[PDB]
Amino acid sequence: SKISASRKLQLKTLLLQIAKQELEREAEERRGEKGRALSTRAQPLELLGFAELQDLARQLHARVDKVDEERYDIEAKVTKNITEIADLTQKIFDLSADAMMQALL
């Protein structure tokens, strides 16, 4: 080999060493992406007039029934993906020293 296997192993270890860091960096990006997507989709509450304060609480109640349906539809898509992933993965799978050194020396 053109290089030592000790360097070859040292380079492989540094490749995963940063690939992990890019993954945690990716999680921090996704954490910020979520908070931004939540300040847009869930504009926080702030106050009212006892009469026309209610028609917003009525509007919130109708929102929950729609949000959870949108949450169900994307969930059932993730659920069907789990079925295919496990199905696809099923298809492809088919295709002592220290105790001696002391008892010697």
Partner 1 sequence: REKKKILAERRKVLAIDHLNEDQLREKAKELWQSIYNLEAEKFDLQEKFKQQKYEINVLRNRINDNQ
Partner 2 sequence: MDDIYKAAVEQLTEEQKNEFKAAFDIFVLGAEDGSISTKELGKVMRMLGQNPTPEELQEMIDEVDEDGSGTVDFDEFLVMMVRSMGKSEEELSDLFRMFDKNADGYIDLEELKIMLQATGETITEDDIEELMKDGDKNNDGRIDYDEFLEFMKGVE
Instruction: Say how many residues make up the chain.
Output: 105
Q: Which of 3, 11, 16, 64 binds partner 1 (CB under 8 A)?
A: 64
d(CA 36, CA 40): 6
The four Cα atoms 33, 34, 37, 42 give a dihedral, to 10 degrees, of -160
Report which secondary-structure segment, H or E, holds 38: helix 5-41
Stretch that binds partner 2, among 14-22, 33-41, 47-55, 79-87 (CB under 8 A): 14-22
Which residue, chain included where needed, has tokens 């060493």?
A: 17
Q: Which of 9, 48, 53, 56 binds partner 2 (CB under 8 A)?
A: 9
Site for partner 2 contains 85 (CB under 8 A): no
Binding site for partner 1 (CB under 8 A): 30, 34, 37-38, 41-42, 44-45, 47, 50, 53-54, 56-58, 60-65, 67-68, 70-71, 74-75, 77-78, 81-82, 84-85, 88-89, 91-92, 95
